[PDB]
């Protein structure tokens, strides 16, 4: 059996620091494997064998442990870090894997650039009319959406989906969806898609009034 | 270059079968032990078998859950390995890998770039995909956000590009949500003002499943 854990489940880091993250065995092996994983792609080796470095991985990265207890360790912390790392052996059938631990990179607060859209035309005419709006390259990940049709707050039929950290900005993005038929649609006038963040205090909020064309 | 691609993934309802394959190319494909590993969705990494090289005799091992139902072999002229699923069931659905193993029990070196299997009774579905254009001439601060709304699919995923790929920057394309059996995602691109809409902004979507292929052009509206 033996189970891996791994600790923290979330890694905050400033590039330029110094991180190192733990695998522990709940039973003696006699090596640990890494692997790093962004989000859309297939894990890699990263680590072999406790401290060898896979092909191609930056010398800043650096791996250790014995027995029940590893780690890895990056010297100096680089955006393009963020990712999910695991930890794995082969011991006994089956070999396991840890949970992971996601290195979130550390950087200043960014407001939403939020961006509201009628349903399209299209859409409409087939009876179904969404409200789609975009609140992309923001920071931190934490965030609220309210939605408002003419001054009256409303949660039912939203639907969020929320990005990975970006690579390179290392910002978040979100789209919110509020789903209506054509009519419910047309009993209204303004429609609003709110944004509370750590950003401000007061809220974003972009809004649109219904015009039949 | 060690290179891993697997084909085959796809929706198939429960009880059924469907086998994956994984083209190896790079190294020779008969002295390396084989694996299959899938990551549910939310879940670990889980490991499923192997087979074994030509010293060892090309002995398989497969782990408890899929052991019986799941077979591992190599292609007897093409450089491919299979996985054979049979009597699947909605816990199986998930990303599947091929992944070589450096040497015996030791750790997976190098690996395919997954494929995906849904285990579903719901049905097949094409995407309706709606241009999102301001209902207003918007420009006040610079930049303009331009988006497409896929809504409505089944079985994951359909993929999205703006211009062909051309329109690489500023696009943010999001997670798909599932509702009552059906899937809706939504993409946005970011252009300056001059490329739009002087230059044609078009939202190009595929859904294999359906072999559907679609490509919206962002037209402004008022």
């Known amino acids: 059996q033996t189970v891996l854990s791994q600790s923290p489940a979330i890694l905050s880091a400033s590039p330029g620091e110094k991180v190192t993250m733990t695998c522990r065995a709940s039973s003696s092996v006699t090596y640990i494997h890494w692997y790093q994983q962004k989000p859309g792609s297939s894990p890699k080796s990263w680590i072999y064998?406790?401290?060898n470095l896979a092909s191609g991985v930056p010398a800043r990265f650096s791996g250790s442990g014995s027995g029940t207890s590893y780690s890895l360790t990056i010297s100096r912390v680089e955006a393009e870090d963020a990712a999910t790392y695991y930890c794995?052996?082969?011991?006994?059938?089956?070999?396991?894997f840890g949970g992971g631990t996601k290195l979130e990179i550390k950087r200043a607060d960014a407001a939403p650039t939020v961006s509201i859209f009628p349903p399209s035309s299209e859409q409409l005419t087939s009876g179904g009319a969404s409200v789609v709006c975009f609140l992309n390259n923001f920071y931190p990940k934490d965030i609220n959406v309210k939605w408002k049709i003419d001054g009256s707050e409303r949660q039912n039929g939203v639907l969020n989906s929320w990005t990975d950290q970006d690579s390179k900005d290392s910002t978040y993005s979100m789209s919110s969806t509020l789903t209506l038929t054509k009519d419910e649609y047309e009993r209204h006038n303004s429609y609003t898609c709110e944004a509370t963040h750590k950003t401000s205090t007061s809220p974003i909020v972009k809004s649109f009034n219904r015009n039949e064309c | 270059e060690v290179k891993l691609v697997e084909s085959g993934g796809g929706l198939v309802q429960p009880g059924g079968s469907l086998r994956l394959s994984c083209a190896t190319s790079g190294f020779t494909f008969t002295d390396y032990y084989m694996n299959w590993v899938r990551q549910p969705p939310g879940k670990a990494l889980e490991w499923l078998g192997f087979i074994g090289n030509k010293a060892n005799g090309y002995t398989t091992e497969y782990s408890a859950s899929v052991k019986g139902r799941f077979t591992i072999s190599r292609d007897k002229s093409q450089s491919i390995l299979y996985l054979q699923m049979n009597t699947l069931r909605a816990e199986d659905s998930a990303t599947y890998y091929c992944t070589r193993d450096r040497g015996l029990r030791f750790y997976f070196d190098y690996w395919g770039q997954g494929t995906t299997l849904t285990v579903s009774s719901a049905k097949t579905t094409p995407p309706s995909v709606y241009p999102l254009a301001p209902g207003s001439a918007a420009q006040t601060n610079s930049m303009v956000t331009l988006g497409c709304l896929v809504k409505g699919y089944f079985p994951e995923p359909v993929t999205v590009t703006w211009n062909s790929g051309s329109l690489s920057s500023g696009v943010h394309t999001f997670p798909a949500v599932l509702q009552s059996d059906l899937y809706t995602l939504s993409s946005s691109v970011t252009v300056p003002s001059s490329p739009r809409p002087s230059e044609t902004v078009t939202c190009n979507v595929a859904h294999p499943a359906s072999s559907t292929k679609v490509d919206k052009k962002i037209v402004p509206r008022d």
């Open positions: 064998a406790t401290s």
């Open positions: 794995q052996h082969w011991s006994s059938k089956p070999p396991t």
